Amino acid sequence: MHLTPEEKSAVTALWGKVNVDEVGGEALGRLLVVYPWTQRFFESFGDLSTPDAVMGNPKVKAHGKKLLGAFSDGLAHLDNLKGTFATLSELHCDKLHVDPENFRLLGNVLVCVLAHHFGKEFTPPVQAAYQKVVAGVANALAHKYH
Amino acid sequence: MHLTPEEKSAVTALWGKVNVDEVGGEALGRLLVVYPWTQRFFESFGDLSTPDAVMGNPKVKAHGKKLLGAFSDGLAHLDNLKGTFATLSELHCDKLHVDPENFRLLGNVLVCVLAHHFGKEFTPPVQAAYQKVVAGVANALAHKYH
Amino acid sequence: MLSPADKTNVKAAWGKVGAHAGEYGAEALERMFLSFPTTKTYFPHFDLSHGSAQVKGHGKKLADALTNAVAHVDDMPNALSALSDLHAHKLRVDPVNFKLLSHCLLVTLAAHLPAEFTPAVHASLDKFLASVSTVLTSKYR
Amino acid sequence: MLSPADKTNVKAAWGKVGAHAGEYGAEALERMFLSFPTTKTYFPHFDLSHGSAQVKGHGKKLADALTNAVAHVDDMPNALSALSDLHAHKLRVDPVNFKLLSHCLLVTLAAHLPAEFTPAVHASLDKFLASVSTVLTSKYR
Ligand code: HEM
Ligand code: HEM
Ligand code: HEM
Ligand code: HEM
């Protein structure tokens, strides 16, 4: 991924303030609420009948912590997203059968969650930097589809 | 841009039979008919009120031949589309103000035109090779946008 | 959105398709799987190889639904209501994929309808498929 | 497509926005120009520097239209008839850009509405913006 020194510092500085468990649970929850077709992979998680049921589902929170943890690790390798996520890409294509459009949806929900979480500190230039990063991550997760 | 030997041989063989003049005119005209908001960049071209006006319009035919000619030369540099189209990219951004979504639309119309012209010879694998190419050319044209 | 001329255009073109509708539906799917490999994520339980009876079978149902949509162009929400339910609540296909299949159906018709696929008919068919796509995703949320 | 509870959610949240709607409209544009630079291709005639009167002016007109839509949520096609005309016939903005502005308006609302931007209200707001976008592009062809 190609970001300027300014963009990278802005991403890293904000991320230091993020509770990865809390934010990951929130972002996955909102994905399944706002775009409910994304629930198709998670029937084994149990009760997704209402927004509160989604947001309070412990299996949703658990998965959310797991994927944002991998994301979080990605931020340390902004210069090699493709290589960092190569094996996850294969896994999502070949075994999980996840349409990569879902990664783009999650990216946009994540940006909304950060804005909600950080309010005025999530300035337009900081948003712009995170938009590059989530498109970068979605592209890297989609890279090995065939 | 990387293709398989099968994809590259599919692309270059069919392209040898294409009259850039005739096809370029049809592709631009169908773009202007099927997605009439694209007419916003051709106000000085005159009569675009009806399909038959668009398709018989000499400036459309002329402009068609010009852009598919540039497209054509790009087919000779498939390994470096970004380098090939850099100058035209900057032009389309800074002087012409063309939303790069238009490049993708033209891509898909061009594929429809090849299918219309070549019929059964435009098989599903040949289409797949061309879809890769028109996406690569579109991305190459959008590269220097800022 | 569908003008009287669009409606006339679609019936004329689809009339021309006739008994081939199923064949063309299968070809459209195959073009889609090869051109846009991500769409294959929705069919992990299929044999997608060329000539697959599963693909031929699905192509026929697709074509049949389109035939029903053309015959009910003025009341498409009702005629495709169960298909709208199925896609929204069970299959849950991301709406972006509908544009990819629509494009592939357009390419298939182009390759088989030389005389009939004029610029005017092309535009009407593209509008028709967008309308069908809209109906099929109308209950997603 | 907008359920009765969606309408209630949107009305409550836009109510909260209140007199800040113009400010928020200008901010959403600024976010769009920065995050999605291709959207600047539609404003080559504007000074797009931060705080520009043209941007602030356009922000207010943007907010006014959305306020109109929220006030006539049960009759948006007729309420936004003129604006639908203007985008289809004159401005002719590619439909993909409406999703980008919608995303930036959501981010703007999230950043300003901590208490109100719950998962349900987020979903209702996203649906609302798609509906507005659908109406504004409904006469394109
Ligand atoms: C940036 C976003 C994402 C990242 C970094 C990510 C990462 C991961 C990780 C680390 C795993 C575990 C792999 C293993 O067990 O070896 C996983 C599993 C999985 N992910 Fe993704 N993922 C992302 C997006 C998504 C999205 C949006 C969906 C679908 C809506 C999804 C669906 C799944 C599924 C279904 C599993 C398996 C669940 C299980 O077996 O418990 N992923 N993901
Ligand atoms: C494969 C994609 C394309 C290529 C290779 C291409 C190439 C070119 C070239 C070589 C020129 C001529 C410049 C000159 O002679 O000075 C040009 C100009 C132009 N192009 Fe593109 N073009 C493409 C797509 C498009 C599309 C889709 C649109 C907009 C719908 C567009 C709109 C224009 C405009 C407005 C001009 C200037 C016409 C004039 O001088 O009056 N281009 N293009
Ligand atoms: C014009 C749009 C579409 C039409 C008319 C359509 C219609 C249909 C029909 C008639 C069925 C079969 C219902 C039955 O079994 O009774 C079906 C099933 C299905 N559709 Fe759609 N479809 C459309 C688009 C799509 C797209 C874009 C995708 C995915 C890329 C998709 C994925 C599926 C899947 C996964 C099945 C189930 C196949 C099986 O296992 O039998 N559909 N569709
Ligand atoms: C929620 C979607 C939108 C709404 C409610 C909206 C509404 C408006 C309004 C109220 C006007 C001014 C009408 C007048 O005073 O005559 C306007 C103008 C304009 N809009 Fe839209 N807009 C939307 C999305 C977009 C998008 C996505 C773009 C471009 C990326 C865009 C580009 C323009 C342009 C270029 C103008 C003219 C500005 C000027 O020169 O004053 N609009 N819009």
CA–CA separation, B145 and D73 (whole Å): 37
Ranges assigned E (strand) in chain A: none
Rounded CA-CA distance B27/B109 in Å is 6
B122 contact residues in C (CB cutoff 8 A):
107, 111
Which residue, D36, A120, D112, C123, is CA-closest to B32? Answer: C123
Ligand 1 pocket, CB under 6 A: A 38, 41, 66-67, 70-71, 88, 91-92, 96, 98, 102-103, 106, 137
Neighbours of C114 (CB within 10 A): 12
**Residues A7, A10, A11, A17, Cα dihedral to 10°:** 180
Q: Are D92 and B48 in contact (CB under 8 A)?
A: no
Q: Which chains touch C (3 or more CB pairs under 8 A)?
A: A, B, D
Do the Cβ atoms of D122 and A112 come closer than 8 Å? yes
CB spacing of A99 vs C41 below 8 angstroms: yes
Residue D138, classed as helix, strand or coil, is coil
Contact C9, C124 (CB under 8 A): yes
Q: How far is CA B82 from CA A20, B24, B74, B87, C22, in A?
A: 38, 22, 10, 10, 41
Residues contacting residue D26 through CB under 8 Å, at least 6 positions apart: D55, D56, D58, D59, D60
- CA of C83, nearest ligand number: 3
Residues of A in contact with C88 (CB under 8 A): 37
Separation of C57 CA from ligand 2 center, angstroms? 43
Q: B81: alpha, beta or left, given left = phi > 0 and alpha = psi -120 to 50?
A: alpha
Q: For tokens 């926005």, what's the residue? A: D17
| 3-state secondary structure string across chain B | CCCCHHHHHHHHHHHCCCCHHHHHHHHHHHHHHHCHHHHHHCHHHCCCCCHHHHHHCHHHHHHHHHHHHHHHHHHHHHHHHHHHHHHHHHHHHHHCCCCCHHHHHHHHHHHHHHHHHHHHHCCHHHHHHHHHHHHHHHHHHHCCCC
B120 CB neighbours in chain C (<8 A) are 111-112
CA–CA distance, D1 with C2 (Å, rounded to integer): 20
Specify the amino acid at residue A71: F
CA–CA separation, C130 vs C134, rounded Å?
A: 6
Domain that holds residue B142: 1-146
Name the H helices within D36-140. 53-71, 76-79, 81-86, 96-112, 119-136
Angle subtended at Cα B92 by Cα B90 and Cα D88, rounded to the nearest 5 degrees:
150
Q: CB-side exposure of C65: number of CA atoms within 13 Å?
A: 19
The alpha carbon of residue B124 is apart from the nearest alpha carbon of chain C, in Å, by 5
Q: Is A99 on the interface with C (CB under 8 A)?
A: yes
Q: Is D112 annotated as a binding residue?
A: no
Q: How many helices (H) and strands (E) does chain C have?
A: 7, 0
What resolution in angstrom units was achieved for this structure?
Answer: 1.8
Q: How far apart are CA B122 and CA B129, in angstroms?
A: 10
Gap between the Cα atoms of C41 and C59, Å rounded: 17
Residue holding tokens 């890769």?
Answer: B132
Chain C residue with minimum CA distance to A102: C94
Closest CA to D40 of B97, A124, A132: B97
Helix/strand/coil for D9: helix
Closest approach of chain D CAs to the CA of C138, in angstroms?
7
Joined tokens for residue B121: 């010879």
- Rounded to an integer, what distance in angstroms lies between the CA atom of residue B98 and that of residue B86? 15
Write the CATH number for A84. 1.10.490.10
Domains of chain D as residue ranges with CATH: 1-141 (1.10.490.10)
Number of independent structural domains in chain B: 1
Cβ of B98 within 8 Å of Cβ of D94? The answer is: no
B47 and B103 Cβ atoms separated by less than 8 Å: no
